[PDB]
């Protein structure tokens, strides 16, 4: 019963701001401003796809595209550890980013997810 977390919400953006527009009769976008923010919501996933074809499922260390640093701090405030460890990991986000690994889990039923093996700190 370790943890769950959702990083992005392509449900809403894809089915509300892309597909109602691109799938009209004789389709034509309203403005180019729609697509560049699509670059904001697809360059992250493209960074994922481009950094796992290289390292073949396991990556050392963790890139910021798999986890933004503010969200890493949020995860620091999440796992069951004592609060002094939370403070230390907050102060050494770069170190825990260096030590952490990442392994690729399933894609089925299109809810694509992957595991991070970020280090604990016992003593």
């Amino acid at each position: 019963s370790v943890l769950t977390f959702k990083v992005l919400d392509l449900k809403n953006y894809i089915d509300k701001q892309l597909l109602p527009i691109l799938n009209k009769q004789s389709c034509s976008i309203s403005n180019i401003e729609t697509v560049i923010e699509f670059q904001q919501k697809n360059n992250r996933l493209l960074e994922i796809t481009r950094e796992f074809s290289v390292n073949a499922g396991v990556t050392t260390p963790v890139s910021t595209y798999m986890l933004t640093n503010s969200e890493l701090l949020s995860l620091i405030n999440d796992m069951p550890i004592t609060n002094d460890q939370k403070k230390l990991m907050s102060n050494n986000v770069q170190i825990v980013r260096q030590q952490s690994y990442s392994i690729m889990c399933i894609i089925k039923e299109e809810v694509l997810a992957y595991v991070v093996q970020l280090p604990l700190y016992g003593v």
């Epitope: 069951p80 550890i81 004592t82 002094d84 460890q85 403070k87 230390l88 604990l120 700190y121 016992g122 003593v123």
Partner: nanobody, 121 residues
């Protein structure tokens, strides 16, 4: 593995005083220290924690900087100062040598004898 501490007595509230803790451990440098207190009547609760070099101090909500803890690792001892005091703080205080768990949770292994501190009147 034993533990002896002192500093008890009857002192009026609102004054700083010393609580000594004088463990005779052979490798007292690594283990985490806690101070807890058992009130007369109401059961025991955690007070203060200190971690090795003393750079990750933590306190319970009863004292925010009121009880300031330090340890001298070379003299293998602990000192707790009562910067702020309250009449409800009367209790038997216990040094506890806790050992880190799998994640780091303190097991609070073998304790001290416990020193009674009274602050009534």
């Amino acid at each position: 593995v034993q533990l002896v501490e002192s500093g008890g007595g009857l002192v009026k509230p609102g004054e700083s005083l010393r609580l000594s803790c004088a463990v005779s451990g052979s490798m007292f440098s690594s283990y985490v220290m806690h101070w807890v207190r058992q009130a007369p009547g109401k059961g025991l609760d955690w007070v203060s924690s200190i971690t090795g070099g003393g750079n990750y101090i933590s306190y319970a909500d009863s004292v925010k900087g009121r009880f300031i803890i330090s340890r001298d690792n070379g003299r293998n001892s602990l000192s707790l100062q009562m910067s702020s005091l309250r009449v409800d703080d009367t209790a038997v205080y216990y040094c506890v040598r806790g050992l880190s768990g799998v994640m780091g949770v303190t097991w609070f292994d073998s304790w001290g004898q416990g020193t009674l501190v009274t602050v009534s009147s």
